[PDB]
Amino acid sequence: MEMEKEFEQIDKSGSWAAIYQDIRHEASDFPSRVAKLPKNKNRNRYRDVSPFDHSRIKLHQEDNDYINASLIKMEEAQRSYILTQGPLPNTVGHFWEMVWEQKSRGVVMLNRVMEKGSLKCAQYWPQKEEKEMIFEDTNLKLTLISEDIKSYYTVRQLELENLTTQETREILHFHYTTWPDFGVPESPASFLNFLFKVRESGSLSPEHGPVVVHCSAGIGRSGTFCLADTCLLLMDKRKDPSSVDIKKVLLEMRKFRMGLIQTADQLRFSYLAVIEGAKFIM
Numbered sequence: 582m583e584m585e586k587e588f589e590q591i592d593k594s595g596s597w598a599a600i601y602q603d604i605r606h607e608a609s610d611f612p613s614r615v616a617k618l619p620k621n622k623n624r625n626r627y628r629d630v631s632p633f634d635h636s637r638i639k640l641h642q643e644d645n646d647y648i649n650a651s652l653i654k655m656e657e658a659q660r661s662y663i664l665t666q667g668p669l670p671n672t673v674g675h676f677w678e679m680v681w682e683q684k685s686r687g688v689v690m691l692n693r694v695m696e697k698g699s700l701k702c703a704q705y706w707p708q709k710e711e712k713e714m715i716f717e718d719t720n721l722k723l724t725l726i727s728e729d730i731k732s733y734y735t736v737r738q739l740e741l742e743n744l745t746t747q748e749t750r751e752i753l754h755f756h757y758t759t760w761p762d763f764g765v766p767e768s769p770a771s772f773l774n775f776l777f778k779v780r781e782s783g784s785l786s787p788e789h790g791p792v793v794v795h796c797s798a799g800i801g802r803s804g805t806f807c808l809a810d811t812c813l814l815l816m817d818k819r820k821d822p823s824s825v826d827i828k829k830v831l832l833e834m835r836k837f838r839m840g841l842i843q844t845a846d847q848l849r850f851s852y853l854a855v856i857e858g859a860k861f862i863m
């Protein structure tokens with residue numbers, strides 16, 4: 582079926598939970614043996630969210646190459662994304678090592694450091710120009726260059742230096758700051774505006790390594806971001822845009838990381854975002 586009318590048909594019939602449970606039943610199951618090794622317990626935020634072995638990002642280190650991060654490679658859309666958890670106190674150096682080694686231009690953050698009164702990720706970037714950060718375990722230096730605070734999101738320019746080679750690179754930090762502590766946003770308008778700002782920066786384009794996107798677990802809000810982006814790109818590429826099947830795209834992405842889209846409300850919000858976004862594109 583088309584999307585907008587499939588949408589109204591699920592609303593009128595109140596069957597979002599049944600649709601979402603079908604997706605969960607059909608989703609791929611692949612091994613994640615490296616994630617579960619005992620030496621990696623303090624590298625995982627949640628025991629039930631792990632990268633598959635076949636698609637995990639490897640650190641360029643011979644001691645321990647493990648990080649909780651996955652490469653989502655979308656062949657028809659010609660887009661790639663790295664989805665990862667929010668960094669932990671003992672993985673902030675690994676996080677920036679990955680950004681460096683994978684040649685990413687942008688980092689997309691969809692959570693606040695504190696939500697619901699608890700810490701959802703480490704304070705992993707500097708908040709003042711004159712107070713830079715040094716990650717001694719991976720030999721990197723990170724400096725805040727500029728910051729632009731808007732009503733729904735903040736954009737930061739960061740300098741990452743590889744202290745071993747003295748090479749430097751400019752990284753863009755796109756921080757969506759207004760996702761509610763509970764539920765999903767009422768309108769997709771600010772989330773779509775944010776997606777378009779990431780696109781306009783070049784961070785999603787083939788001349789750079791894959792964008793790094795995270796929330797707390799790296800599957801819920803993060804999944805919504807890449808699902809909406811890929812569906813809108815396919816609607817632009819194909820002769821028949823009504824042929825784009827959001828449930829099929831989501832199942833394809835779940836071949837590369839488990840659990841993408843965590844609730845039926847996030848599924849409905851993804852439909853809403855793609856539907857509204859397709860009208861603005863034209």
Ligand SMILES: CS(=O)(=O)NCc1ccc(Cl)cc1
Pocket residue numbers: 610611612613
């Ligand atoms: C977590 S696991 O890797 O041990 N199991 C996944 C699995 C899926 C499907 C089949 Cl046929 C077999 C195994």
